[PDB]
Design a protein around this ligand. Structure first.
Ligand SMILES: *[C@@H]1O[C@H](CO)[C@@H](O[C@@H]2O[C@H](CO)[C@@H](O)[C@H](O)[C@H]2NC(C)=O)[C@H](O)[C@H]1NC(C)=O
Ligand code: NAG
Ligand code: NAG
Ligand code: CA
Ligand code: CA
Lengths: 128, 232, 213, 232
């Protein structure tokens, strides 16, 4: 019955909130705030850079995670108008995305050919 | 005995998409048909729908004369005047009307306040407040919507835009939507649509329900896994 | 004394323009006090355009375009398919208070194409929103939207590709229109399926999706 | 007395874009210019720029073949032969070389093993091992780069692909990189770029440094700034 507030997939943070009915009285029901954050201990600071240093500090601004500037459509009396959902936005992130695929260009040398081939940083998402 | 000279606001030129201009002559003196003729700078009579008002409680004759000139005349900044021609009590009134010229533009920082926990304990009449503040031309239109469908206009009262106390140039305007407490306690989503000139897409929608409100117990879990490079 | 087909002329195409009406082979323009997006939805649903967007009651010079004013006033419920279904009861009362006309602007109808294939119903997926032919994203691309796209063109069912023919059928050039297209399999077109906003994606062109039917 | 029959590996086709062919003749006989003629199935002579540039202590001359056979001709799987014309010891050395037809393609599942702490405690050198394992075509090309520029090919040692013990159809190779102790302890990221036929992208790369490879110390710092408030 819990709804998903954000389901951010490159900063692993699944914010859900449920109004769990703790009693028959509908006033003392507590509004839960489940924030499930999966912290990659082996991912680097720039995830598209293999040679980047390992990430030691993970900072999760939940005001930035809960941001919404996909403009929704509301229906007025004589018009359909795009509606901005937040005043915050008008970005670095720590985990790979399962839907996306990230690539890196590495120099491969056989003598002096120096062919700049590409490398699939994750293998499963590019070629399932 | 009173008169009005209402200009088209940003409400009446956005939800209806037609700049309606009327000078509400309100029960001055018993006349057969109070003619109302809007005029431009040269002074020709704009084609005005002159409607005779219904029987007032004070029963003196009133009229509503509206002429829907389009957006170019109001956007150009040209003053108007309805030449209300008086044969009975012959005192002509030049009720002038013009757009605000050269006013500033500041974005409305709209916030949505859920009903107070003190108020919900009385089990009726939850009041949700759409605090629209920080708008400079002082013309704001606020509509409350349920699930994308607009609410009744009697369900909410939007205050007139009063000046901001701290900031001199900006203004603010409340919107008290009174709903049943059993409606708000089911987590029903309430959306405040606010329209103003300074907004980029010209309409802002903020949503509130019991899930969006301040959580009384967080459930933070920080899974520290060294193998999940991707996300679950 | 009833709508006999409408049109949206004197404007940018057949989807946007001044709304008129036909009765016993006289073309009558429409002017109403009670007119909202409901009557716009009926007008754009009858004529053939996609979806109603905006409706004004705009000014003009009264000497130009003086078709005679449709005196019967209707109040459309919103989900009526045709203006025959709209209640046009009162015949005789003049309701056009001011000498204006109604300007309905509909969305262009949905044209979904499979571009890049070898002249079958295959290739990268391309959609038409307003005037731009653009691709969609594959964030969460499943079999339900696959068979929805295959049934939109009327070209059978999906063959369930294994990303080889999906990759080899074009990288796709153009603005990405749709992201996170989550279907159900029963929608007759991709516009009925939920997605992100039109053009508000998060993926590049290399994350394009092809559909093989 | 020994003539090589070295085939074009997938490195020499994937990087140089031409299937380089050779049959290096070492200390065979005293014949003035050892004539290497690359012969196809039809037997026609392709352009063979034979190179004589190696000095032998036994005063016996050397010859290296050269063929510009395209990739589509080699991938058809035909039996090739340099028909070496001999006037001294006139025995036609029809050396046979062909593609293994119908072999399976299993991608290398590559792991980068950081050097063991026992070798770290020597304070002399560190040995980084790349475990390119489970590849079926059995022609591996692993290249090392130190945080962006490629390393020297003589700095690392690449083992020949031996048959994998626990799986019949797989082959495994080692890439041993012997770097200094103070180079490893500064935390330079060492990459293992391996090129192979069997991957769809044909090239993958794994990365280790001091922090990533071995969990000697995990300085994690988690900051959740807001942890409150409204969210929708
Ligand atoms: C993370 O690494 C990637 C790859 O090195 C960076 O992307 C490069 O950005 C520069 C500057 O815009 C471009 O010239 C390159 O072509 C990009 N390379 C690729 C493969 O996209 C990226 O900028 C890095 N991000 C940060 C924050 O440092
Ligand atoms: C540990 O991480 C914190 C977080 O940024 C950083 O300030 C500190 O310098 C780090 N210490 C070491 C020894 O890496
Ligand atoms: C939320 O709290 C419940 C206990 O009330 C717990 O079982 C559950 O695991 C928590 N959610 C998460 C994501 O940890
Ligand atoms: Ca994708
Ligand atoms: Ca997406």
């Amino acid at each position: 019955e819990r709804i998903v507030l954000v389901d951010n997939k490159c900063k692993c943070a699944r914010i859900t909130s449920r109004i769990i009915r703790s009693s028959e009285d509908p006033n003392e029901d507590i509004v839960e705030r489940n924030i499930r954050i999966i912290v990659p201990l082996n991912n680097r600071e720039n995830i598209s850079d293999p040679t980047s240093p390992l990430r030691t500090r993970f900072v999760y601004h939940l005001s930035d995670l809960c941001k919404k500037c996909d403009p929704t459509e509301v229906e007025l009396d004589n018009q359909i108008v795009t509606a901005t959902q937040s005043n915050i936005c008008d970005e670095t992130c720590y985990t790979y995305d399962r839907n996306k695929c990230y690539t890196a260009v590495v120099p491969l040398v056989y003598g002096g050919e120096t062919k700049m081939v590409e490398t699939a940083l994750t293998p499963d998402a590019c070629y399932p | 005995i009173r008169v009005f000279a209402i200009p088209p606001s940003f409400a009446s030129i956005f939800l209806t998409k037609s700049t309606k201009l009327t000078c509400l002559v309100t029960d001055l003196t018993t006349y057969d048909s109070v003619t109302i003729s809007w005029t431009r700078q040269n002074g020709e009579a704009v084609k005005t729908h002159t409607n005779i008002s219904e029987s007032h409680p004070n029963a003196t004759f009133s009229a509503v004369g509206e002429a829907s000139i389009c957006e170019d005349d109001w956007n150009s900044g040209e003053r108007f005047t309805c030449t209300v021609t008086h044969t009975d009590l012959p005192s002509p009134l030049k009720q002038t009307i013009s757009r605000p010229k050269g006013v500033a533009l500041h974005r409305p920082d709209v916030y949505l306040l859920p009903p107070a926990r003190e108020q919900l304990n009385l089990r009726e009449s939850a009041t949700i407040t759409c605090l629209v503040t920080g708008f400079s031309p002082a013309d704001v239109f606020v509509q409350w919507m349920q699930r994308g469908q607009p609410l009744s206009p009697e369900k909410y009262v939007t205050s007139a835009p009063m000046p901001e106390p701290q900031a001199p140039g900006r203004y603010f305007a409340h919107s008290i939507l009174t709903v049943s407490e059993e409606e708000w306690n089911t987590g029903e989503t309430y959306t405040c649509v606010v329209a103003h000139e300074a907004l980029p897409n010209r309409v802002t929608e903020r949503t509130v329900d019991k899930s969006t409100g301040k959580p009384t117990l967080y459930n933070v879990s920080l899974v520290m896994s060294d193998t999940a490079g991707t996300c679950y | 004394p009833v709508p006999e087909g409408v049109r949206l002329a004197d404007g940018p195409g057949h989807c946007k323009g001044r709304v008129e009406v036909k009765h016993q082979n006289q073309w009558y323009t429409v002017c109403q006090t009670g007119w909202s997006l409901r009557a716009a939805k009926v007008v754009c649903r009858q004529l053939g355009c996609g979806r109603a967007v905006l409706t004004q009651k705009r000014c003009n010079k009264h000497a130009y375009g003086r078709k005679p004013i449709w005196l019967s006033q209707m109040s459309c419920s919103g989900r009526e398919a045709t203006l025959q279904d709209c209640p046009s009861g009162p015949w005789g009362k003049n309701t056009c208070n001011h000498d204006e006309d109604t300007w309905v602007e509909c969305e262009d109808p949905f044209d979904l194409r499979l571009v890049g294939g070898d002249n079958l119903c295959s290739g990268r997926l391309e959609v038409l929103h307003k005037g731009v032919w653009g691709s969609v994203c594959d964030d969460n691309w499943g079999e339900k939207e696959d068979q929805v796209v295959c049934k939109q063109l009327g070209c059978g069912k999906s063959l369930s590709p294994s990303f080889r023919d999906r990759k080899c059928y074009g990288p796709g050039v153009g603005r990405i229109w749709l992201d996170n297209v989550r279907c159900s399999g029963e929608e007759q077109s991709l516009e009925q399926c939920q997605h992100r906003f039109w053009g508000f994606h998060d993926c590049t062109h290399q994350e394009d999706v092809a559909v093989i039917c």
